[PDB]
Design a protein around this ligand. Structure first.
Ligand SMILES: CC(=O)c1cccc(N)c1
Length: 164
């Protein structure tokens, strides 16, 4: 079946717990595979040690810039950027996992987890999974955001990987 992956997240050096994500490889195999491999680190790079750098309460929590840690960087397992696979899955509510981008066909490694329905992103960001377990952890992360996106605690993915 579809991959299950995890992110273990610290805030100011203390553990919040684990977010478990299902990746919809049935719908978006290329996008799911990128995220899966960045979680395991099997290509020699990935999410381990990187941050949630942009967090906006009542919107989303964004992470995955493991090169610049500020929202300008990241890279995929295919190359620096890759196309929008499809827009078949929608931003239906809290827990949606979707690719951050800088316009059409600029997926790399940055991603976000929604804390509300974000319907205006449909057709612009590729949705590729959802939170299976750990929305409590996501709500903690969310609570350390601000309107500007600046975080009030240092939010770090200390460990990540594949469960199945
Ligand atoms: C600025 C830039 O290159 C960027 C920003 C957000 C997501 C991604 N994949 C790239």
């Amino acid at each position: 079946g579809n991959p299950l992956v995890y992110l273990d997240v610290d805030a100011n050096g203390k553990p919040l717990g684990r977010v478990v994500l299902e990746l919809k490889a049935d719908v978006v195999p290329k996008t799911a595979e990128n995220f899966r491999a960045l979680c395991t680190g099997e290509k020699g790079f990935g999410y381990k040690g990187s941050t949630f750098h942009r967090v906006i309460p009542s919107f989303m929590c964004q992470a995955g810039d493991f090169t610049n840690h500020n929202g300008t960087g990241g890279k995929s397992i295919y190359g620096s950027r890759f196309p929008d696979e499809n827009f078949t899955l929608k931003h239906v509510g809290p827990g949606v996992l979707s690719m951050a981008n800088a316009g059409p066909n600029t997926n790399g490694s940055q991603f976000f987890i929604c804390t509300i329905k974000t319907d205006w992103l449909d057709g612009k960001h590729v949705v590729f999974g959802h939170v299976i377990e750990g929305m409590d952890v996501v709500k903690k992360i969310e609570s350390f955001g601000s309107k500007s996106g600046r975080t009030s605690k240092k939010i770090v993915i200390t460990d990540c990987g594949q469960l199945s």
